[PDB]
Design an enzyme around this catalytic site. Structure first.
Site, PDB file in Angstrom:
ATOM      1  N   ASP A  91      -4.579  -6.970 -30.422  1.00  0.00           N
ATOM      2  CA  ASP A  91      -4.768  -5.807 -31.303  1.00  0.00           C
ATOM      3  C   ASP A  91      -4.251  -6.063 -32.710  1.00  0.00           C
ATOM      4  O   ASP A  91      -3.580  -5.232 -33.285  1.00  0.00           O
ATOM      5  CB  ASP A  91      -4.062  -4.584 -30.698  1.00  0.00           C
ATOM      6  N   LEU A 127       5.879   8.190 -38.232  1.00  0.00           N
ATOM      7  CA  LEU A 127       5.795   6.982 -39.029  1.00  0.00           C
ATOM      8  C   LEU A 127       4.581   6.145 -38.674  1.00  0.00           C
ATOM      9  O   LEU A 127       4.316   5.124 -39.314  1.00  0.00           O
ATOM     10  CB  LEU A 127       7.056   6.142 -38.855  1.00  0.00           C
ATOM     11  N   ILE A 165      -0.779   2.757 -29.834  1.00  0.00           N
ATOM     12  CA  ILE A 165      -1.876   2.825 -28.863  1.00  0.00           C
ATOM     13  C   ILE A 165      -1.537   3.785 -27.693  1.00  0.00           C
ATOM     14  O   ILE A 165      -2.420   4.431 -27.144  1.00  0.00           O
ATOM     15  CB  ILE A 165      -2.411   1.388 -28.401  1.00  0.00           C
ATOM     16  N   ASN A 166      -0.254   3.883 -27.340  1.00  0.00           N
ATOM     17  CA  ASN A 166       0.214   4.823 -26.309  1.00  0.00           C
ATOM     18  C   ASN A 166       1.536   5.520 -26.673  1.00  0.00           C
ATOM     19  O   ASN A 166       2.569   5.291 -26.051  1.00  0.00           O
ATOM     20  CB  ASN A 166       0.277   4.176 -24.902  1.00  0.00           C
TER      21      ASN A 166
HETATM   22  O1  LIG Z   1       4.255   0.032 -32.465  1.00  0.00           O
HETATM   23  C1  LIG Z   1       3.643   0.681 -33.309  1.00  0.00           C
HETATM   24  N1  LIG Z   1       2.454   1.239 -33.123  1.00  0.00           N
HETATM   25  C2  LIG Z   1       1.455   1.257 -34.175  1.00  0.00           C
HETATM   26  C3  LIG Z   1       2.040   1.908 -35.434  1.00  0.00           C
HETATM   27  C4  LIG Z   1       3.469   1.504 -35.622  1.00  0.00           C
HETATM   28  N2  LIG Z   1       4.247   1.643 -36.717  1.00  0.00           N
HETATM   29  C5  LIG Z   1       5.490   1.158 -36.451  1.00  0.00           C
HETATM   30  C6  LIG Z   1       6.644   1.142 -37.388  1.00  0.00           C
HETATM   31  C7  LIG Z   1       7.820   0.462 -37.049  1.00  0.00           C
HETATM   32  C8  LIG Z   1       8.902   0.480 -37.927  1.00  0.00           C
HETATM   33  N3  LIG Z   1       8.793   1.157 -39.084  1.00  0.00           N
HETATM   34  C9  LIG Z   1       7.671   1.872 -39.428  1.00  0.00           C
HETATM   35  C10 LIG Z   1       7.637   2.553 -40.765  1.00  0.00           C
HETATM   36  C11 LIG Z   1       8.838   2.901 -41.400  1.00  0.00           C
HETATM   37  N4  LIG Z   1       8.890   3.470 -42.618  1.00  0.00           N
HETATM   38  C12 LIG Z   1       7.753   3.696 -43.310  1.00  0.00           C
HETATM   39  C13 LIG Z   1       7.783   4.276 -44.579  1.00  0.00           C
HETATM   40  C14 LIG Z   1       6.581   4.492 -45.259  1.00  0.00           C
HETATM   41  C15 LIG Z   1       5.350   4.147 -44.689  1.00  0.00           C
HETATM   42  C16 LIG Z   1       5.275   3.568 -43.416  1.00  0.00           C
HETATM   43  C17 LIG Z   1       6.446   3.325 -42.699  1.00  0.00           C
HETATM   44  C18 LIG Z   1       6.427   2.755 -41.433  1.00  0.00           C
HETATM   45  C19 LIG Z   1       6.556   1.859 -38.585  1.00  0.00           C
HETATM   46  C20 LIG Z   1       5.525   0.699 -35.144  1.00  0.00           C
HETATM   47  C21 LIG Z   1       4.246   0.919 -34.650  1.00  0.00           C
END
Ligand SMILES: O=C1NCCc2[nH]c(-c3ccnc(-c4cnc5ccccc5c4)c3)cc21
Ligand SMILES: O=C1NCCc2[nH]c(-c3ccnc(-c4cnc5ccccc5c4)c3)cc21
Ligand SMILES: O=C1NCCc2[nH]c(-c3ccnc(-c4cnc5ccccc5c4)c3)cc21
Ligand SMILES: O=C1NCCc2[nH]c(-c3ccnc(-c4cnc5ccccc5c4)c3)cc21
Lengths: 285, 284, 290, 283
Positions: free
Chosen positions: C141, C25, C29-30
């Site tokens: 960030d 998803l 960064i780590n």
């Molecule tokens: O801490 C992180 N690091 C950088 C990228 C990130 N995405 C997330 C995140 C958290 C909760 N949900 C999602 C997510 C859920 N469902 C999706 C459906 C379609 C596109 C993107 C989506 C992202 C991403 C957390 C972090």
């Protein structure tokens, strides 16, 4: 060619020259201030008692240096005596029986924007002198601002050098002429806080979540008190209370600001300060 | 409200005010003491000559602080002069021409237990004052105890601050109010050794001396000690403990009944007076 | 009297409670973020996998602290498990399936993007930074990829993610400098906010590419513009606000409190409805966005 | 085989379980104590608020260890919460509504030598427990000695571990400085006040500081003329200025005056009156 005399520390017992009562006139950062009377002249003076050490030596030294300024409490004499087998700096200064700044404001029934400008200008003058001789006061507060007498033309004077510190070709920049940290810009904040209280009667920073509102810079100019106060002044206050020390206005910029410059061209608009101050005797202890 | 005046160091030449003879009145730990006369008043005083430095500065400073006590030699004036192109502290103090403590004892023909008690009490008083203002003397010996005059009512006074050192809510223990090592308890030992000599005429400690001191080997031999009450021996035993912290404090000492009621102490005569002159040799 | 509960780290296997898919998803960064489903409830969540160490412990600690804020992705649970014989922090957070901020902007045509909406977006990003700063945390960030929406539904809340770079930043008259040191950690978020605000109003960054080692110098010099046709409608008040967040000297830069008090953010609903080019310029430039 | 359970720190919000008033019950060395009520049980408790750090972690840790002793305020629960975005140790302890030790003495009209012995014994017991588990309290004062209730059979309890420190032939089994002997002084000071109504070391302020290091105090009349020489001798020994000359807690608990509390003369003391008669210089 202006030279002024340096400090001659008297070594004879202070009780030869003065009658020392034990009426406390104030609590200093390092030792209390007592009421004393000139034995020969009958006249009244204030005595601050310090225990001799490098810290107390610096207070005296720095205070003597600034004592020439009209808006800084004048040192009359400094004694070095033995008190209970320990060395002592005893400082005699002029008697400021006009009381604290906010006590005088608190005693009327009204205070105007123009008078606030005149007060601020005279506090400013004290800071301006200090900074120009490379001294930061570091403790400019309500309790350190006293009047010479009760008579309505008394001079406002700054006291207590217990926290004061020293701050250190011809086209050369100010940074290249000696280091210097944020000691000075810290007086500029006090000036903002005092100015804020002078215009409304309460501090900008209120009642452990206060500590964070200060570092965040969260305050307002709430009504009804601030609805008359010109945007020009609000803008000056905003600029002294900048949380980032280097964004803050310098004392020269401040003394040049038109609101301070032309005290007598500031609107005579009345402020709530006088009443809000007595109406809030409680949370002022 | 008692304040006493601080020290004003005079900068003018001492010879403006005093005539300086070179009759030696004693040898101090750092410089000798000379006899001098007040040019204007003709009156006699003592001058101790010190070479200016942090050490000498401390002696003067500490001595001035203690100078208020009745049982400590009084400083009259302090001069700072140039002597052979070097800076100098010159201390003028009152003249103690009554001589050393054991010289006065040595000159009769008898000394009593009650008088020893009165002597010990006045030395005690000097130490008590010093300790109360946080100064250890660290050099209480026979040579440093002199009398103001020869007149029989003269006051005994303590001299020489060459070794003196500074020793540093409201229910908090004495250890929690500042560190402080064994500087003070070291005076308490001197007090014991002086008391011992006062009662019999010789020291309790006689390269094998060095070990008898660290071991704590001494006695109360007869005939001298056979008269001396067990109460006093017990007090001496407690001042001469080899372990510094086991030793009695100056407050405990001044409260001890033998010191407290000097005038309720038996008039029993001691051998001190004679043993002292009879032993002029090994006293050099 | 407001206390909130502290962090209880679950020790049991995460697979007792969740079905873990390997649909990625996002890349953090780590460690990457995976799609997972509550075994009992069927509901969807996101799992971030970190390897236990002082660094990961700090991320969790700081994120938990900030998790209260409405505009910061909510942590549901933290597991400590053994994965291939090494310790693991596993963070379970709410699912932000609305996608990235600039993906939602990029998907219209029908009613174009307006200056007023940019103001509403900037205000909610600001609210997250304001909270963080007020509890002495710098995010360090704040980028496009870290700004996601809770759902696709048009009333979804925008949320900030990723505490992988987050760092702690440490009477009545006392100056702010005399209450604890504090370097430039915070003012560095203020710059991001300026860069995000710029892109939100025209669809490209203020600092470009090409030469491209010459982008690095245009940033330290502060060389950028408000070129036409995109910026010709944008009020001078806004340009002045951006100019002030993008100051190259960190101390000259506006603080978060000054920003939240700026009339353009304060009164989002009094901001002209003027349409911007953002929507189109963004899809029209899918290439150099990889 | 005696094991006692270790400390489980609760992580859920304290307001789930308790209603937190802002009535101040005391001022601690690092944070005040508030009155709180058990939401389900209605019962009253005391909450000490500390900001999480190594210092606060140690207070909790050491207090928990000593919490077993009958004469030390009992910790009920410890919460770790977020308060204004900073971490917090919140300590819930039993409510000591009996008030301070010297408030209870101050409220009669008489106090006897035998009762002073019983009080000193129970303080002794708390110190004895602490020392046996290698903890010095370092802050045994009047304000830290409270009673469980107003009922005349209430237990006296010691509070506040803000200064408490761990203390590690007897010398060859681990170093150990003067941390412990410093409690022994407190015990002497408390005992002195308990017998006459004033402290051994006075006001008159910078010359008090020297009377403490010199060890200058007395047993003045009329208060002390009744008090047996045996007790004066015990006080003399706890108030030795030299820490190593001072009595240990074991020697203290074995002294006949403490040992046989019920064989101590019933002689009345002035404490009760001297204490109310001197409300002024006690602020
Ligand atoms: O801490 C992180 N690091 C950088 C990228 C990130 N995405 C997330 C995140 C958290 C909760 N949900 C999602 C997510 C859920 N469902 C999706 C459906 C379609 C596109 C993107 C989506 C992202 C991403 C957390 C972090
Ligand atoms: O350095 C200081 N420490 C903190 C407070 C203070 N007050 C003084 C001071 C100096 C001279 N006069 C006074 C004084 C005299 N008379 C008064 C009468 C009534 C109210 C205040 C008065 C202050 C106070 C000095 C200091
Ligand atoms: O500080 C000192 N160090 C050790 C030597 C000393 N003698 C003195 C002293 C002080 C005052 N008076 C005298 C004195 C005066 N007259 C005397 C006459 C006969 C013998 C000794 C005498 C000592 C000595 C002080 C010190
Ligand atoms: O650790 C501490 N620091 C010093 C002050 C304090 N009081 C307490 C405390 C603990 C438990 N109960 C109380 C208490 C409760 N209710 C009271 C009612 C009336 C008087 C005193 C009371 C004390 C105080 C703990 C601490």
């Amino acid at each position: 060619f202006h030279v002024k005399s340096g400090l001659q520390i008297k070594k004879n017992a202070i009780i030869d020259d003065y009658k020392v009562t034990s009426q406390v006139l104030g609590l200093g950062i390092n030792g209390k201030v007592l009421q004393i009377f000139n034995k020969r002249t009958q006249e009244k003076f204030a005595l601050k008692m310090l225990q001799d050490c490098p810290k107390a030596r610096r207070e005296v030294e720095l205070h003597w240096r600034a004592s020439q300024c009209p808006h800084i409490v004048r040192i009359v004499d400094v004694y070095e005596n033995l008190y209970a087998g320990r060395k002592c700096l005893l400082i005699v200064m002029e008697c400021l029986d006009g009381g604290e700044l906010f006590s005088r404001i608190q005693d009327r029934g009204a205070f105007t924007e123009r008078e606030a400008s005149e007060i601020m200008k005279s506090i400013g003058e004290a800071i301006q002198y200090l900074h120009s001789i490379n001294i930061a006061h570091r403790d400019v507060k309500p309790e350190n601002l006293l009047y010479t007498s009760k008579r309505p033309n008394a001079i406002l004077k700054l006291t207590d050098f217990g926290f004061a510190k020293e701050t250190t070709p011809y086209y050369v920049a100010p940074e290249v002429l000696g280091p210097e940290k944020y000691d000075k810009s810290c007086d500029m904040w006090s000036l903002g806080v005092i100015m804020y209280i002078l215009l409304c009667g309460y501090p900008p920073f209120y009642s452990p979540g206060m500590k964070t509102r200060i570092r965040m810079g969260q305050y307002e100019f709430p009504n009804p008190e601030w609805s008359e106060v010109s945007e020009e002044v609000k803008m000056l206050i905003r600029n002294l209370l900048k949380t980032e020390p280097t964004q803050r206005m310098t004392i020269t910029e401040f003394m040049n600001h038109p609101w301070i410059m032309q005290s007598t061209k500031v609107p005579q608009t009345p402020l709530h300060t006088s009443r809000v101050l007595k109406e809030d005797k409680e949370r002022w202890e």
